[PDB]
Symmetry: C6
């Protein structure tokens, strides 16, 4: 019944920052990832273009590679040593949140 006009603009938020230490080979391949299976870091970012910035921060933080960047949805999958990927995820959230005023989530993990 009640009616309203909504002007949409993207928010600034890292919704997910999640570590999987030992993902399955099938999951890894279904994501289109190449190289030996490794730990992955998974980011959900709005606006979608901030994925570019998260990639730069992450790869500059240590020996982490971009598994994939999706500038259309904001998704980023990072690869590398599990502790390095964790450090990257932390740097991404630290930088976006503290220096660019994004809402950020805590780093979450799947280690088993």
């Amino acid at each position: 019944t009640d009616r309203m006009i909504q002007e949409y603009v993207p928010g600034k938020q890292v919704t997910l920052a999640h570590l999987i230490a030992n993902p399955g080979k099938d999951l890894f391949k279904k994501l289109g990832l190449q190289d030996a299976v490794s730990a992955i870091g998974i980011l959900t970012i709005t606006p979608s273009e901030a994925s570019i910035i998260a990639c730069d921060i992450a790869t500059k933080s240590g020996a982490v590679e971009i598994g994939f960047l999706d500038r259309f949805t904001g998704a980023v999958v990072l690869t590398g040593d599990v502790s390095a990927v964790e450090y990257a995820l932390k740097q991404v959230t630290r930088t976006l949140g503290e220096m660019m005023q994004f809402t950020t989530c805590s780093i979450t993990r799947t280690l088993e």
Copy 2:
């Protein structure tokens, strides 16, 4: 008509977690699923990237396979023994809900 700016960000929610014990061959095929027809588990997840995590929790929970993952829509279809898929769905919802503050739905079933 009232007017408001709405900054969009994805929520954190498992909206569907549904078991179909005996899906028809046509459906199973229209979904692009391969192998013999089996029970399927159907998940709807926001943000879409959390489908990756749900897949990991599911395949680690027992003898359940990824039928498909859609990181763009957040859909996951799981395959395996009906009881194993059921356990996987419960583990996805238990884990995302209790450990990651997602809103979760109850597990629903089509057994006939």
Copy 3:
């Protein structure tokens, strides 16, 4: 002027459940439907993945076939005898609404 953050999640709703007893051949073909022209049942479902469940309920209800399933938008077109398609549409809304707490619309028809 006024500003708000909106966390989006899909609702649970069957918005359309509509019967067309005698659709035109041009409409039928433009929808990419095969076989002899027949009555059609048209569903609009959120979240999109619940289209899979609606298909299963519908095809289990009687001699109704999936014309198409669209798991990306939630659209389902059913085909068969007009009264069978009507029964299917009713079973879909009955099951989603009563057992899965979806908001459901009434079955609507175009018989002429």
Copy 4:
């Protein structure tokens, strides 16, 4: 900044129902329309699947053809005699509005 979860579902609305008596050949061609240029009727419909119903009501109302149907966006372009397309647009809006509780717009025209 205030924050809210918004569960999305499509509304039921015909937002545009517009007659162009004499569209230019370039436009008619940029729309992918075939046959000789004719008057066109333009519909915007939510939910998108209701475009199927609008098409049926239109073609059954008289000598009007589907130029195209888009079940993804809900767009319908109708073709035929300008007066017949006009009658079709009025029948789409009368039927969806009175019989199916859609919000409907007034019919608008470009006659020059």
Copy 5:
């Protein structure tokens, strides 16, 4: 925390109506525009199908051509003499706003 269902329908609005007298050749080509570089008129229109109407009004207003029409997003790029394109943009906003009750923006320009 707080939760609401939002039934979405498109608004009726021309958000952008902007003139660029001398766009760069690289910008012109990246937009996929053909012919000699010329001034461009840029429209943002909701619902997306109203782009069709804006095109018709614009091309009927004088010697303005459709650079492109995007019925999926509502974008229209017009080409021609800078003053003619300006006149077109004004006719589009005049007609949609005054005769079809769209919210319209003012015409904005980049002349240098």
Copy 6:
């Protein structure tokens, strides 16, 4: 659960205006950018078509090139001398904000 109809229209906003002085070669390549790696400027703009205007303001402001434009998402990536890209980003935000009533973000930078 409360319910409301929301008519959607795009807002007018520059959400991101970000300088990366030294992006890695892999990122630069994953973005589909050609030529030698250079500093990049990253814009997020609503409505998406305003990316066209931002491009024009940027290339006219000095020796800055369009790496890419995305009129569907509103993304712009600029390339050139780090100081020139910075000036371009400031001119995009100054111009859209002061002359066209867009909400604008502050310019942000990754210099390390």
